[PDB]
């Protein structure tokens, strides 16, 4: 995250850290006790699917304070329409091997109904994006969880204000074109969370951009509203042998 602030410990309780062989891979969002939403592109280069770990309750990566909960990732589900190395359909649904225990420091973000998300949440101007990604373009990653308030743009306006992948109906733009504030490498997969009448909801996934905090460009986020029914169906399904599962979309 570029140009944000430290998320006070426990104020981003749905944030997930994904690790491969102990190394930071990506972020994610807890949506109930066994399910995490992340970005498909995070898994393009995974060789051993059995070394993926999700950590909940994380805050300061330099220490252990006892609020952290680590789980093996039992399933990584990606839509059939996602093509590795590209930007469209950038979403993954992860099943944890064992549920996390909800606590003051581990709480799911609400996955909204599609209609609510499209008709109401899509018009809330500002939303929070968070992660332990790079603090600057070409810079070191964060040791404490960072958070940034970003305004959403209608895609027509994003394209007009921007100056290369298309912005599809499965994406939206948010942030700033002055190079000061953006999500960055390492934040991929993390939440774009939107507040409405006292409750927070998952509206986007940190996905891509032209570099990070690039002047003349905005951050691009997976439009989660397009995937609500796909996600809900998969969460009712029984697990299958083998971690990676490609599931038909729609």
């Amino acid at each position: 995250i570029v140009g944000g602030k430290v998320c006070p410990k426990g104020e981003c309780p749905w944030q997930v850290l994904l690790l491969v062989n102990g190394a930071q891979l990506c972020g994610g969002t807890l949506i109930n006790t066994i399910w995490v939403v992340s970005a498909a592109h995070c898994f393009d280069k995974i060789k051993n699917w059995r070394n993926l770990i999700a950590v909940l309750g994380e805050h300061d990566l330099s220490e252990h304070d006892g609020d952290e909960q680590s789980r093996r990732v039992a399933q990584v589900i990606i839509p059939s329409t996602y093509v590795p190395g590209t930007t469209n359909h950038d979403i993954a649904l992860l099943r944890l091997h064992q549920p996390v225990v909800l606590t003051d420091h581990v709480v799911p973000l609400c996955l909204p109904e599609r209609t609510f998300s499209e008709r109401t949440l899509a018009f809330v101007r500002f939303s929070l994006v968070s992660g332990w990604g790079q603090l600057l373009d070409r810079g070191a990653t964060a040791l404490e969880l960072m958070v940034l308030n970003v305004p959403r743009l209608m895609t027509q306006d994003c394209l007009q204000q921007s100056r290369s992948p298309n912005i599809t109906e499965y994406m939206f733009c948010a942030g700033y074109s002055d190079g000061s504030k953006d999500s960055c490498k390492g934040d991929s997969g993390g939440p774009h969370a939107t507040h409405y009448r006292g409750t927070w909801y998952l509206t986007g996934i940190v996905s891509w951009g032209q570099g990070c905090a690039t002047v003349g460009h905005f951050g691009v986020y997976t439009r989660v509203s397009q995937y609500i029914e796909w996600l809900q169906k998969l969460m009712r399904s029984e697990p299958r042998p083998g971690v990676l599962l490609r599931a038909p979309f729609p």
Partner: protein, 58 residues
């Protein structure tokens, strides 16, 4: 009332029904109050609420 305007007055989710009818609903871990619009937690850790801040104003 209609769900596309003002969320139909619902705190959370809204369904339009045949006639001038509307039903609000709440996410799991919440129940709908008698006003027909508000949602109140039914569990300790409902989704989308931040415990340390909910306690900070309790």
């Amino acid at each position: 009332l209609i769900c596309v305007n003002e969320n139909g007055g619902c705190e959370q989710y809204c369904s339009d029904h045949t006639g001038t009818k509307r039903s609000c609903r709440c996410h799991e871990g919440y129940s709908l109050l008698a006003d027909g619009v508000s949602c109140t937690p039914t569990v300790e850790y409902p989704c989308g609420k931040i415990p340390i801040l909910e306690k900070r104003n309790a």
